[PDB]
């Protein structure tokens, strides 16, 4: 069922975006704010871009959606220090993310 | 190539000796983890990574990172956020990233 998947992913993504630790991940990181970011990170990802991909019917499987969302987190942990606010936010939001996937029974 | 090999060996060994590595040392058994292999399609562990290393599979940083990252993401996907295993995954992942940055791999 394609619109089953779509509705579930929309719901999940929207809850992730509304989470209080989502703020670092809402938009493409700007080169002005992140020194040499696009030299280090070859596959940049963010929640805006994920919203568009969703709207564009790109997420035809769980696996694709997970991959982009995990990329958000791995980009962040690759680039930032472990005790930085952004790294902490990545793990809080990841925990939340997994709890919402488990809730939905996405399999 | 033996530059890469030595660096990866060193990193992997340090990861395996870390006090939070214990959940990841061997393949998870279906007897101990209900429906694990239904949820997790690409299982990974540090024993298996040691073998792959010895087997000269890790010809690039990217391949090594991928398998090690998979160890953590498998664990977080399957376990509760406040479970001991989930906590260990993040402690060990932090340690891991600090060691790869130290070596100038990523
Ligand atoms: C997911 N967001 C980031 O990874 C990020 C990192 C940023 O880090 C700057 C920096 O100097 N980081 C750094 C510090 C020490 C060592 C290496 C990198 C700055 C803005 C960043 O993007 C956010 C995008 C919108 O929210 C505010 C900033
Ligand atoms: C990386 N290891 C695991 O993910 C794991 C999960 C296991 O599942 C236990 C379990 O019931 N987890 C669970 C708890 C609440 C809800 C769903 C699953 C069992 C053994 C597991 O690994 C073994 C424990 C450490 O010793 C060797 C491997």
What residue owns the CA closest to ligand 2's atom 7? Answer: B33
Q: Are A95 and A22 in contact (CB under 8 A)?
A: no
Q: Are B25 and B47 in contact (CB under 8 A)?
A: yes
Cβ contacts (< 8 Å) between A98 and chain B: which residues? 76-77, 81
Count the neighbouring beta carbons within 10 Å of the beta carbon of residue B81: 17
- Whole-number Å distance, alpha carbon B68 to ligand 2 midpoint, is 17
Q: How many structural domains compose chain B?
A: 1
Cβ contacts (< 8 Å) between A91 and chain B: which residues? 90
Spatial separation of the C-alpha atoms in residues B106 and B97, rounded to whole Å: 8
Q: In testing the pocket of ligand 2, which one of B32, B38, B39, B48 has its CB within 8 Å of the most ligand atoms?
A: B32
Taking alpha carbons only, the member of A4, A3, A19, A11 closest to residue A73 is A19
Q: Are B76 and B20 in contact (CB under 8 A)?
A: no
Q: What resolution does the deposited structure have, in angstroms?
A: 2.4
Spatial separation of the C-alpha atoms in residues B74 and A100, rounded to whole Å: 16
Taking alpha carbons only, the member of A77, A107, A104 closest to residue A91 is A77
Q: Are B106 and A39 in contact (CB under 8 A)?
A: no
Q: CA of A19, closest CA in chain B: separation in Å?
A: 16
Spatial separation of the C-alpha atoms in residues A99 and A91, rounded to whole Å: 12
Count the neighbouring beta carbons within 10 Å of the beta carbon of residue B86: 22
Q: Please tell me whether residue A54 adopts helix, strand or coil conformation.
A: helix
Taking alpha carbons only, the member of A93, A45, A104, A66 closest to residue B40 is A66
Spatial separation of the C-alpha atoms in residues A70 and A101, rounded to whole Å: 13
- One DSSP character per residue, A62-99 reads HHHHHHHHHHHHHHHHHHS-TTSHHHHHHHHHHHHHHH
A91 at the B interface (CB within 8 A)? Answer: yes
Q: What is the CATH number of the domain that holds B94?
A: 1.20.920.10
Q: How far is CA B20 from CA A13, B15, B43, B53, in A?
A: 31, 9, 19, 21
Q: Which long-range contacts (C-beta less than 8 Å, at least 24 apart) are formed by B78-81?
A: B78/B33, B78/B36, B78/B39, B78/B40, B81/A95, B81/A98, B81/A99
**Structural domain harbouring A65:** 1-107
Spatial separation of the C-alpha atoms in residues A57 and A98, rounded to whole Å: 22
Q: Please tell me whether residue B19 adopts helix, strand or coil conformation.
A: coil
Label residue B17 exposed, middle or buried (CB < 10 Å: 0-12, 13-18, 19+).
exposed
Q: Are A36 and A79 in contact (CB under 8 A)?
A: no
Spatial separation of the C-alpha atoms in residues A21 and B5, rounded to whole Å: 38
């Amino acid at each position: 069922d394609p619109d089953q998947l779509y509705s579930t992913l929309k719901s999940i993504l929207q809850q992730v975006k509304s989470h209080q630790s989502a703020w670092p991940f809402m938009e493409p990181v700007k080169r002005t704010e992140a020194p040499g970011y696009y030299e280090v990170i070859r596959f940049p990802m963010d929640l805006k871009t994920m919203s568009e991909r969703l709207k564009n019917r790109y997420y035809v499987s769980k696996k694709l959606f997970m991959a982009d969302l995990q990329r958000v987190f791995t980009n962040c942990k690759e680039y930032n220090p472990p005790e930085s606010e952004y790294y902490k936010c990545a793990n809080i939001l990841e925990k939340f993310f997994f709890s919402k996937i488990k809730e939905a029974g996405l399999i």
